[PDB]
Enzyme design. Structure first.
Site, short mmCIF file in Angstrom:
data_model
loop_
_atom_site.label_atom_id
_atom_site.label_comp_id
_atom_site.label_asym_id
_atom_site.label_seq_id
_atom_site.Cartn_x
_atom_site.Cartn_y
_atom_site.Cartn_z
N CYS B 109 0.83 -1.20 0.00
CA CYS B 109 0.00 0.00 0.00
C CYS B 109 0.87 1.25 0.00
O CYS B 109 1.58 1.52 0.98
CB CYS B 109 -0.94 0.04 1.21
SG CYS B 109 -1.79 1.62 1.33
N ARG B 112 0.11 4.73 2.80
CA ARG B 112 0.16 4.48 4.23
C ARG B 112 0.53 5.70 5.06
O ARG B 112 0.52 5.59 6.28
CB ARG B 112 1.12 3.34 4.53
CG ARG B 112 0.54 1.96 4.29
CD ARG B 112 1.59 0.91 4.61
NE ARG B 112 2.58 0.79 3.55
CZ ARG B 112 3.74 0.15 3.69
NH1 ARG B 112 4.07 -0.40 4.87
NH2 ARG B 112 4.59 0.07 2.67
N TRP B 281 -9.30 6.32 -0.73
CA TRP B 281 -9.60 6.99 -1.99
C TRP B 281 -8.63 6.46 -3.03
O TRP B 281 -7.78 5.62 -2.74
CB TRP B 281 -9.47 8.51 -1.89
CG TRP B 281 -8.20 8.98 -1.27
CD1 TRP B 281 -6.98 9.14 -1.89
CD2 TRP B 281 -8.03 9.39 0.09
NE1 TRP B 281 -6.06 9.61 -0.98
CE2 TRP B 281 -6.68 9.77 0.24
CE3 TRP B 281 -8.88 9.45 1.20
CZ2 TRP B 281 -6.16 10.21 1.46
CZ3 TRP B 281 -8.36 9.89 2.41
CH2 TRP B 281 -7.02 10.27 2.53
N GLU B 286 -4.97 3.84 -10.81
CA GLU B 286 -5.75 2.62 -10.64
C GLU B 286 -6.88 2.56 -11.66
O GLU B 286 -7.13 1.51 -12.26
CB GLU B 286 -6.30 2.51 -9.22
CG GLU B 286 -5.28 2.29 -8.13
CD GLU B 286 -5.97 2.06 -6.77
OE1 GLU B 286 -6.60 0.98 -6.60
OE2 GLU B 286 -5.91 2.98 -5.92
C1 HEM Z 1 -6.07 6.51 1.98
C2 HEM Z 1 -5.96 6.32 0.66
C3 HEM Z 1 -5.30 5.04 0.08
C4 HEM Z 1 -4.60 5.02 -1.06
C5 HEM Z 1 -4.31 6.25 -1.91
C6 HEM Z 1 -4.15 3.66 -1.29
C7 HEM Z 1 -3.38 3.22 -2.35
C8 HEM Z 1 -3.14 1.89 -2.64
C9 HEM Z 1 -2.81 1.31 -3.93
C10 HEM Z 1 -2.65 2.09 -5.25
C11 HEM Z 1 -2.66 -0.02 -3.75
C12 HEM Z 1 -2.34 -1.07 -4.83
C13 HEM Z 1 -3.70 -1.71 -5.12
C14 HEM Z 1 -3.69 -2.35 -6.48
O1 HEM Z 1 -2.87 -1.92 -7.33
O2 HEM Z 1 -4.52 -3.28 -6.70
C15 HEM Z 1 -2.92 -0.32 -2.35
C16 HEM Z 1 -2.87 -1.56 -1.74
C17 HEM Z 1 -3.31 -1.90 -0.47
N1 HEM Z 1 -3.89 -1.03 0.45
FE1 HEM Z 1 -3.80 1.03 0.29
N2 HEM Z 1 -4.63 2.88 -0.26
C18 HEM Z 1 -5.36 3.69 0.60
C19 HEM Z 1 -6.02 3.29 1.76
C20 HEM Z 1 -5.96 2.07 2.37
C21 HEM Z 1 -6.64 1.68 3.60
C22 HEM Z 1 -7.57 2.65 4.37
C23 HEM Z 1 -6.31 0.40 3.87
C24 HEM Z 1 -6.73 -0.52 5.04
C25 HEM Z 1 -7.51 -0.15 6.08
C26 HEM Z 1 -5.41 -0.05 2.82
C27 HEM Z 1 -4.81 -1.28 2.72
C28 HEM Z 1 -4.19 -1.76 1.59
C29 HEM Z 1 -3.76 -3.13 1.39
C30 HEM Z 1 -3.88 -4.28 2.42
C31 HEM Z 1 -3.23 -3.21 0.16
C32 HEM Z 1 -2.61 -4.49 -0.49
C33 HEM Z 1 -3.67 -5.11 -1.39
C34 HEM Z 1 -3.16 -6.36 -2.06
O3 HEM Z 1 -2.09 -6.90 -1.63
O4 HEM Z 1 -3.83 -6.82 -3.02
N3 HEM Z 1 -5.21 1.00 1.94
N4 HEM Z 1 -3.19 0.88 -1.72
N1 LIG Z 2 -7.02 2.90 -3.49
C1 LIG Z 2 -7.35 1.71 -3.18
N2 LIG Z 2 -7.06 0.67 -3.99
C2 LIG Z 2 -6.94 -0.63 -3.57
C3 LIG Z 2 -6.48 -0.97 -2.29
C4 LIG Z 2 -6.37 -2.30 -1.89
C5 LIG Z 2 -6.67 -3.31 -2.79
C6 LIG Z 2 -7.11 -3.01 -4.07
C7 LIG Z 2 -7.45 -4.12 -5.04
N3 LIG Z 2 -6.30 -5.02 -5.28
C8 LIG Z 2 -6.68 -6.06 -6.27
C9 LIG Z 2 -5.45 -6.74 -6.86
C10 LIG Z 2 -5.88 -7.93 -7.69
C11 LIG Z 2 -6.63 -8.94 -7.09
C12 LIG Z 2 -7.05 -10.05 -7.81
C13 LIG Z 2 -6.70 -10.14 -9.15
C14 LIG Z 2 -7.13 -11.31 -9.96
C15 LIG Z 2 -7.48 -11.12 -11.29
C16 LIG Z 2 -7.88 -12.21 -12.07
C17 LIG Z 2 -7.93 -13.48 -11.51
C18 LIG Z 2 -7.57 -13.67 -10.18
C19 LIG Z 2 -7.18 -12.58 -9.40
C20 LIG Z 2 -5.96 -9.13 -9.75
C21 LIG Z 2 -5.55 -8.04 -9.03
C22 LIG Z 2 -4.74 -6.97 -9.73
N4 LIG Z 2 -3.76 -7.56 -10.66
C23 LIG Z 2 -7.25 -1.67 -4.45
C24 LIG Z 2 -8.13 1.44 -1.90
C25 LIG Z 2 -9.18 0.61 -1.64
C26 LIG Z 2 -9.45 0.72 -0.28
C27 LIG Z 2 -8.54 1.61 0.26
O1 LIG Z 2 -7.70 2.04 -0.75
#
Ligand code: HEM
Ligand code: A1BT2
Ligand code: HEM
Ligand code: A1BT2
Ligand code: H4B
Ligand code: H4B
Ligand code: ZN
Lengths: 411, 411
Positions: B109, B112, B281, B286
């Site tokens: 993330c 953070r 947000w 994304e």
């Molecule tokens: C506040 C604004 C936030 C921004 C701008 C942000 C940004 C991002 C981005 C761009 C990713 C990559 C997601 C992807 O490419 O699929 C990510 C991942 C992640 N975010 Fe943040 N996020 C935010 C808030 C949060 C919050 C509030 C939480 C938890 C309470 C969180 C937990 C996570 C986690 C666990 C991942 C890893 C997801 C994974 O491994 O698939 N995020 N974040």
């Molecule tokens: N700003 C934000 N964003 C954000 C944050 C955390 C997680 C994600 C979503 N993360 C999805 C990654 C992913 C998961 C499963 C598949 C997948 C696709 C096809 C088959 C199986 C699995 C592919 C991807 C991306 N390659 C977005 C956000 C959301 C909440 C706070 O902050």
């Protein structure tokens, strides 16, 4: 023991068993991954024979004579020569095999689909700095081939004792000088400022401009290094114009056609070649993204965005990104309009996936460093962003080595 | 034992000792790095107390009462409750601490820097699907805050036996439907095609269009899941216009304001919360890069490049890159002109470096996943491309979990 890598855009799965033949360590452990650390972490006769044997067993396997008499006689021949001198000498064939597979195994190189088409120049008879210059000029002239670039490597004598060491002190045979300024700014290439003044120390008379091709600093048999100027006719250069914006020529940019890396160490069969410059051709982003737009390089995003009349007030106008694409259209356009070989990050990455399929098929795998394989722009619109990759260290290999001026017992 | 990470643009060095408190494994070994593998690899009362104790020792340390009587009494209190029920219950304070630090520890993330400003909604009194809907609507409405978005998480009852499990079957509270076509093409979002037809299975009547907000599928206490439609007034959406190109509106694109992830597992003190939707947000890329231009997503590079009248013949015209930047100027412009919170990959990455400096200073380190932190475009013109990062797994954490329809013992 039979690992799977997936592509998340094609849903293609490959099985890696080649990593089982991996030898060296990666820097990563079970509780920490160091896959984004840039640089991660004399030889005796005891250590050297297993290395020779392992390399010879894969060499003879590769010619469909694994374990034949010629293998055993060559094994015992090397064993005997390691007994006698505590080192040994590669056959010409073994040297060419090692060089190609060192490249084949370079997990940070996206251009490896070409790894078997490599011209090996054996310079192991060299004895002097002047002989290095001669070998290096012949390399350049051959590899450039009038802009129809050709891949090549020139291999200088292997390290022996340690104090007798051939080294090219340049990081690339061809680089632009960089000079600091009175007001602390920088003309030319800031990456090369320490090297540029080292050359002035040992005697260079600098023409303090932007794109001044540095001289060579060549160290032979461990002696102090000596300056030589590449004949300007052998140094091919491309002026950078844009196919739309005519002010682009007024930027006055240019770059050299031939990327030829010279600071790395080639390891074959436990033997260490400290001077082994290798050349291929450029992926466009190396110049247009990194060389030109790295904040600590030429840093031209400023001026290009000005001439484009972009909203440079806000970060979120993406004026930097917009001026980044134009510059890389310009590098490609310039090189191509001059029949000088270049490849674009899109064509290059597609070939690497195609290369990955072959290695997994006919070799069991392909070591690959995602951090370095993904291009420095337009990442996720190229197929390698979506391609899981396993990194691991096979040998023959290319290794980083300290700079000679930090290690050379001088006089 | 005291590792160094360098930034190769600023020459700044940080020392990491926090990785010593790392617990879980990474997938990497000494001979293989798996830092680009996407998804890498019931509980008993024996295992559960060390986990509780470790978490409580860091919780009480964080309130400047490490080892006080209230710590020991709370330690023995949990010890006793684990003896009695082979599980235990988090205090409200401990639940909020765990949630925030789970986010703090999310090495993928980039956002953070905000980790301590997080609104925790304790939904551990919930018992039914309808109660989940209610809790989830209150989450959405709060987190959206009229476009001045606010970070929040809603935490449903922890897993107990295993067959009684709260799960949100959506991957995000708000997603667009995706429908396959007669000619095999796809309308809407192809990522959601299997989910979209699952909803039609359990009863959804689909309005087969592009941007149809899916219903919720909510499973409570291990029962079969139930469909609910979010009130359209709580679902905030942004139509995508461009600040220069007026045909851009004729593209007719739009996206939802609130990214709220709902398929992940929150782990606190050895306790597992299988339903814990969290929202913040959007980083602009994304939507504009991945959602819109992933070949397996909306895949609009085609149409945008057409309307721009680009040289789509050759790969090396960089027409894809040029149309990629315009689209991301448009997403940012659209969101900003509507006072809906969004951040650009440049502002976000700069904040993460600033966040990294604080963690290394006042915490000993910051786990970070370069493969995921670097934005999917304009990589090397953002500061995190040049920043070495150490990845490692601390707890409390967010973990991936299987999809409920692949695991649910149905009826
Ligand atoms: C506040 C604004 C936030 C921004 C701008 C942000 C940004 C991002 C981005 C761009 C990713 C990559 C997601 C992807 O490419 O699929 C990510 C991942 C992640 N975010 Fe943040 N996020 C935010 C808030 C949060 C919050 C509030 C939480 C938890 C309470 C969180 C937990 C996570 C986690 C666990 C991942 C890893 C997801 C994974 O491994 O698939 N995020 N974040
Ligand atoms: N700003 C934000 N964003 C954000 C944050 C955390 C997680 C994600 C979503 N993360 C999805 C990654 C992913 C998961 C499963 C598949 C997948 C696709 C096809 C088959 C199986 C699995 C592919 C991807 C991306 N390659 C977005 C956000 C959301 C909440 C706070 O902050
Ligand atoms: C044929 C055209 C070639 C292309 C298009 C190409 C492309 C690239 C690129 C873009 C990189 C990353 C370099 C950087 O970002 O600094 C790289 C790395 C590398 N290349 Fe290739 N290359 C080519 C030929 C070769 C040849 C002929 C050799 C050896 C004989 C070679 C060996 C390597 C090695 C060892 C690295 C890793 C360098 C490092 O770790 O710093 N390449 N290549
Ligand atoms: N097409 C080609 N290209 C290419 C291939 C291999 C290697 C390289 C150069 N690789 C340099 C990476 C590097 C090294 C040292 C520093 C550095 C900077 C400041 C202080 C200390 C070290 C920084 C970097 C890049 N971050 C280019 C090519 C050349 C020959 C064949 O193919
Ligand atoms: C193969 C690769 O690991 C995969 O495509 C990853 C790469 N980095 C990523 N980074 C982010 N932020 N999001 C992603 O989905 C991915 N996908
Ligand atoms: C910190 C990071 O490891 C460093 O900047 C790397 C990232 N990936 C790279 N990839 C390539 N091709 N070349 C580089 O110089 C770098 N630099
Ligand atoms: Zn690793």
């Amino acid at each position: 023991r039979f690992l799977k890598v997936k592509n998340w855009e094609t849903d293609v799965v490959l099985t890696d068993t080649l990593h089982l033949k991996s030898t060296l360590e990666t820097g990563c452990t079970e509780h920490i991954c160091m896959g984004s650390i840039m640089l991660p972490s004399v030889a005796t006769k005891d250590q050297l024979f297993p290395l020779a044997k392992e390399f010879l067993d894969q060499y003879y396997s590769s010619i469909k004579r694994f374990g034949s008499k010629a293998h055993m006689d060559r094994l015992e021949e090397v064993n005997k020569e390691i007994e006698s001198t505590s080192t040994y000498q590669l056959k010409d064939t073994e040297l060419i095999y090692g060089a190609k597979h060192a490249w084949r195994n370079a997990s940070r190189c996206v251009g490896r689909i070409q790894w078997s088409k490599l011209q090996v120049f054996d310079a192991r008879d060299c004895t002097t700095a002047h002989g290095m210059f001669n070998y290096i000029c012949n390399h350049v002239k051959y590899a450039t081939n009038k802009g129809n670039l050709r891949s090549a490597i020139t291999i200088f004598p292997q390290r022996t004792d340690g104090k007798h060491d051939f080294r090219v002190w340049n990081s690339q045979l061809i680089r632009y000088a960089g000079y600091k300024q009175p007001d602390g700014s920088t003309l030319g290439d800031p990456a090369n400022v320490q090297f540029t003044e080292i050359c002035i120390q040992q005697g260079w008379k600098a023409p303090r401009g932007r794109f001044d091709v540095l001289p060579l600093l060549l160290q032979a048999n461990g002696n102090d290094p000596e300056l030589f100027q590449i004949p300007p006719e052998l140094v091919l250069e491309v002026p950078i114009r844009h196919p739309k914006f005519d002010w682009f020529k007024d930027l006055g940019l240019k770059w050299y056609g031939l990327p030829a890396v010279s600071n790395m160490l080639l390891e074959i069969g436990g033997l260490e070649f400290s001077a082994c410059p290798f050349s291929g051709w450029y992926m466009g982003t190396e110049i247009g993204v990194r060389d030109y737009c790295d904040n600590s390089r030429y840093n031209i995003l400023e001026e290009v965005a000005k001439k484009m009349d972009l909203d440079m007030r806000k970060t979120s106008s993406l004026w930097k990104d917009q001026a980044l694409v134009e510059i890389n259209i310009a590098v490609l356009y310039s090189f191509q309009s001059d029949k000088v070989t270049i490849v674009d990050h899109h064509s290059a990455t597609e070939s690497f996936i195609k290369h990955m399929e072959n290695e997994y098929r006919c070799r069991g795998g392909c070591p690959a460093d995602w951090v370095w394989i993904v291009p420095p722009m337009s990442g996720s619109i190229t197929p390698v962003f979506h391609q899981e990759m396993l990194n691991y260290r096979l040998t023959p290999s290319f290794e980083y080595q300290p700079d000679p001026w930090n290690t050379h017992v001088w006089k």
